[PDB]
Amino acid sequence: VAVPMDSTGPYRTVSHPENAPSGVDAGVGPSEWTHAYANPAHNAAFPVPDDAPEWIRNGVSWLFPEARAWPLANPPFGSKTYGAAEASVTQTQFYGNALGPSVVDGVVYAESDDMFAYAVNAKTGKLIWRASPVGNNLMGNPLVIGNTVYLSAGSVANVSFNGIYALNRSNGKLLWYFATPGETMATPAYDNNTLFIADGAGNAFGINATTGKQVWKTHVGGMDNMSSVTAYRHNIYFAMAIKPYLYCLNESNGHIVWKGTINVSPAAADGVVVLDATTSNVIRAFDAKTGAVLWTRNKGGVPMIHNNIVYVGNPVASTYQAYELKTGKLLWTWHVPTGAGRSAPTYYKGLLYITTGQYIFVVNPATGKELHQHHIGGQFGIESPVIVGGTVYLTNSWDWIMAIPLKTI
Amino acid sequence: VAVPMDSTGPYRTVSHPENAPSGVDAGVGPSEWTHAYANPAHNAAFPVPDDAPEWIRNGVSWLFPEARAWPLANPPFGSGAAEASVTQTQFYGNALGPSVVDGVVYAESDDMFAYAVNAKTGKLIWRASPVGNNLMGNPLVIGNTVYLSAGSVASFNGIYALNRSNGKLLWYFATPGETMATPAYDNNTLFIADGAGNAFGINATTGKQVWKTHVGGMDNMSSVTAYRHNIYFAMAIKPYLYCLNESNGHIVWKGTIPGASNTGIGNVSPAAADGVVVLDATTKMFSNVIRAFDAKTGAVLWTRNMGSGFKGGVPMIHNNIVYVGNPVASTYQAYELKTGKLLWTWHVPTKVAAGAGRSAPTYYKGLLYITTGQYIFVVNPATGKELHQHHIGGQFGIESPVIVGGTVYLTNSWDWIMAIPLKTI
């Protein structure tokens, strides 16, 4: 397949197979990544067997510069022009990673607004491959299924090129692309050999995850900005702007199941689908199957559902709150010390992990009290911690991929 | 200077000093490039001395792929076809032509790299990407410094100044809005207008700003023209052509093109010669209107309607004749600089629906050279009759041929740098 490229140029695909994990190194972590935040619940927390290799259980520490990497100690580039907050958002949007990484079978995958996708070794941190099949930003986390990694191209604002690009997981070569007129900033969803994505022109597509050819097309209208498609129980759920509805569609034929009302990816667990939006911030849970509104209570946080508890942030209030999944009452509220509340929390072995600002926080899920805080630098806008074994894997808005031992925080 | 980068990453500065020309090869072509299309007249045509090297007088032929280079035979990536031509032009390939100075060809591309290539052989001297934004103009080469302007029509914007030899980053001046337009160099100073409505004088050595003037509106593709101590540039959304003082940046005069589309006036760079400043704009189903101003006072000299049937064409002034394209009508016209009299109109022979005719013609040794569509044309400046046509491929949006001796230098919207012998055309 042909894309605009100089095979000898700086945008060429670079492969270093010697650094790929091998043997028991290649079994570490999940064998697939099907969603933004790896699962419909938006909790990426992966335990390892008792006999797992020592490096992940004890934890590893490595720091990987991405193409436009900026020092974590430095303030936002472009300080005296845009302003501190505007430059933090701007560098996040056009330089660094918007979302977190994808850790599968001993390899950490990230795609950056610097227009490259990376596959890095989860143990050492050395590059397996790097690729730039498209000249546009990549605002999501790579989906790793079988031997194929799936990338989504799109920009914040007929602006460059948009769609899904699918490359070989091993060497990074380009398998196929499916171009769309509207934004694919949203992470697609994978289920049963099919990819599901919504554009900014109001169209949702099923796509064959192998051949790359289109399966079905359904026009819902509106714009999908940051809300990544969620595939749950044979149906796909996604939100649209300019006509603010949450849709449920049939994965096979693309028919519309139901619509519901009230930038954020909806979380689904235990037959419940949670979303929050702005007008303040209102969170609402739906019955996944029939679309009936389960509860409603009084921009926006990305929810996580674990053990029938929703943990979601309030960017206006700069807080994270824990809601009971079915009843929707808020158990506790934790105030961030003085853009907090963008990232989804990670609940692992009885603790909460939150990447916000330049820090990673650990919070007690029972009382909502901060236990520890660990300084890193850079910025975490929407990046969420990915915890596998005793090691935390992160991306940063200054274009970094890192590994930190879980003990260190 | 520190910008967001991985020093070993794919955006690092790559230097191949072995490919730099030396001896008499380092004198070939002009010793400075101060403007889009090299001069306020937008005619880049350089004759060579009789003792000039044999390769430049007879011409060389080579083709250089840029990072996103796409085969010239292939159709536009992402095929509507014409909109994909515009889209790839804007986000992948070169928007403007190259800058040939002292035996080296300089280009900046929307692939976010700047290149220094050997004018003789075609092998890369250096490549650099100090900023993660598009480069929509041609590099300004003055002394030992190359000047880049970064901005996107949709990041970080401004002038980035690189070492001419190895490509290292000397300094940058950041602007609030996009600077897609090529700046202008005059008297140790760079002059640029951004998409936030601001025009700046900037010290071309230290990089510190001299003056800042809030003009309002948006400068999209209209490159600053520095003529007789004054800078001239067009702004959209507030559709005026401005004349500013290079020293203090105060506004001398403002001017208007009647019926100009709100967004149609700010894409074209004004040409200046012999006390006259020429600009054209599209009407807000499409027409194109050209108007000439008195450089000093802004008084309206003459106005003409170029035709009907998108974008405006970039004018050239040579020997008191304006040659300008009309992409709406796919025509080029010749007007007398002072009187506005229409000498001839030439219709583009083949049908390229993209709006052929936006780029500025080049007049060299009694002939017109026009890169439009997939072809470069040779046209009689007297009769406006097509003489020759030469197929290349790709697309030429805003790029104009840079001719040095017997060699034509080109960039293409498929992200290519090429050299063709003038004899071949």
UniProtKB/Swiss-Prot annotation, chain A:
EC top class, as a word: hydrolase
The enzyme's E.C. designation: 3.12.1.-
Reactions listed under catalytic activity: tetrathionate + H2O = sulfur + thiosulfate + sulfate + H(+)
InterPro entries per UniProt: PQQ_b-propeller_rpt, PQQ_rpt_dom, Quinoprotein_ADH-like_sf, WD40/YVTN_repeat-like_dom_sf
Matching Pfam families: PQQ_2
pH dependence: Optimum pH is 3.0.
Keywords: Cell membrane, Hydrolase, Membrane, Signal
GO molecular function, one term: hydrolase activity
Cell membrane among keywords: yes
One Gene Ontology term, aspect cellular component: plasma membrane
Principal cellular location given in the protein's record: membrane
Cysteine disulfide links: none
Subcellular location per the Swiss-Prot or TrEMBL entry: Cell membrane
Subunit structure: Homodimer.
Family of the protein in this entry: Belongs to the tetrathionate hydrolase family.
Function according to Swiss-Prot or TrEMBL: Catalyzes the hydrolysis of tetrathionate to generate elemental sulfur, thiosulfate and sulfate.
Protein name: Tetrathionate hydrolase
Organism: Acidithiobacillus ferrooxidans (strain ATCC 23270 / DSM 14882 / CIP 104768 / NCIMB 8455)
